[PDB]
Design a protein around this ligand. Sequence first.
Ligand SMILES: Nc1nc2c(ncn2[C@@H]2O[C@@H]3COP(=O)(O)O[C@@H]4[C@H](O)[C@@H](COP(=O)(O)O[C@H]3[C@H]2O)O[C@H]4n2cnc3c(N)ncnc32)c(=O)[nH]1
Lengths: 178, 178
Amino acid sequence: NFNVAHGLAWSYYIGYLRLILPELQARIRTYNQHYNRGAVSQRLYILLPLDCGVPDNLSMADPNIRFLDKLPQQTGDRAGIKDRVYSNSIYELLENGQRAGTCVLEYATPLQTLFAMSQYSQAGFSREDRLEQAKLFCRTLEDILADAPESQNNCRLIAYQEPSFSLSQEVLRHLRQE
Amino acid sequence: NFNVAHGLAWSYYIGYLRLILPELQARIRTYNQHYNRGAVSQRLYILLPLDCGVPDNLSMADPNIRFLDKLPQQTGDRAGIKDRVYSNSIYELLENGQRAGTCVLEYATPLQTLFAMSQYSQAGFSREDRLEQAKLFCRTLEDILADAPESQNNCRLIAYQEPSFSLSQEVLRHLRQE
Ligand SMILES: Nc1nc2c(ncn2[C@@H]2O[C@@H]3COP(=O)(O)O[C@@H]4[C@H](O)[C@@H](COP(=O)(O)O[C@H]3[C@H]2O)O[C@H]4n2cnc3c(N)ncnc32)c(=O)[nH]1
């Protein structure tokens, strides 16, 4: 099942990142000018927990990550679905009670597929293989984005293992660099 | 890359079908009672062209398939995205100028990933392998749905090869049976 994470990464690129990354800066600029608090950063920040533990509510993983607003939606006809909607959420990052950064932030959803596959007996995906597939997912995606025309300093991958751990501090480190 | 279609099918189930199938009949019943034309059929009809040719506009594949309306959207928090939106389109099927059926209808989007992967040199997916992966995708999905609790006569797969061909007649055949 090595080809499992491989295909999921290509799917994530083909069916999502390549479609939304080109329009992202315009959506952010629209938000910055129309519905606004400091400036939203210019990159999509993608969280890649190698334990494939992907909560649906980000504030649950860390209270210092607080939902601010939704980006204006992106829509288009997709595979027979009229006006399919692509949604992204903006988060504020707090640090000792100060707003320290603002960004479009989400988990890489395919890591949730890896996790659920490892739970379903019919998937033939060993629970022991979650970390290995997660790593391959990250490496594949990294190699894809390194060479993708739509990636132009508008995407940032954040991969990490928890062994304390501060997810907000991990994100702020990448924001600081930018 | 056999594991390619395998993973895509499990992804399609885990990240989509298992989430939307349980609520689908209530969304259809809501539409039937609130925004209505004959009754919308009770199953989600999924188109699986084995040539992986997936137009984004269904009326383009066959003019006898005409967009009627959107189902009421489904939303939930998903992997850090607040109120992620799941959308489905309702279509009327015409037959010699008569409205002959009405259903929720779409292409299986992962077939688009197979297709695009076969085009990208970095994916290492042979163009010659599209039909084989498409078949495996269909077989895997079929085996998944055969045993899935959320599938309860509310999903129908329509797989086909074009060698004339009438996509509308192919769909109407399955609707007739139901
Ligand atoms: N009609 C309809 N179908 C939907 C919708 N959302 C998902 N589907 C179907 O489920 C497959 C898996 O979805 P996922 O959210 O678990 O992750 C996908 C996948 O890893 C990768 C490629 O997507 P696609 O090829 O369209 O496969 C999707 C589809 O067949 O990108 C991820 N992804 C796709 N859309 C989003 C999004 N809006 N936000 C975050 N991640 C996404 C739906 O709304 N309607």
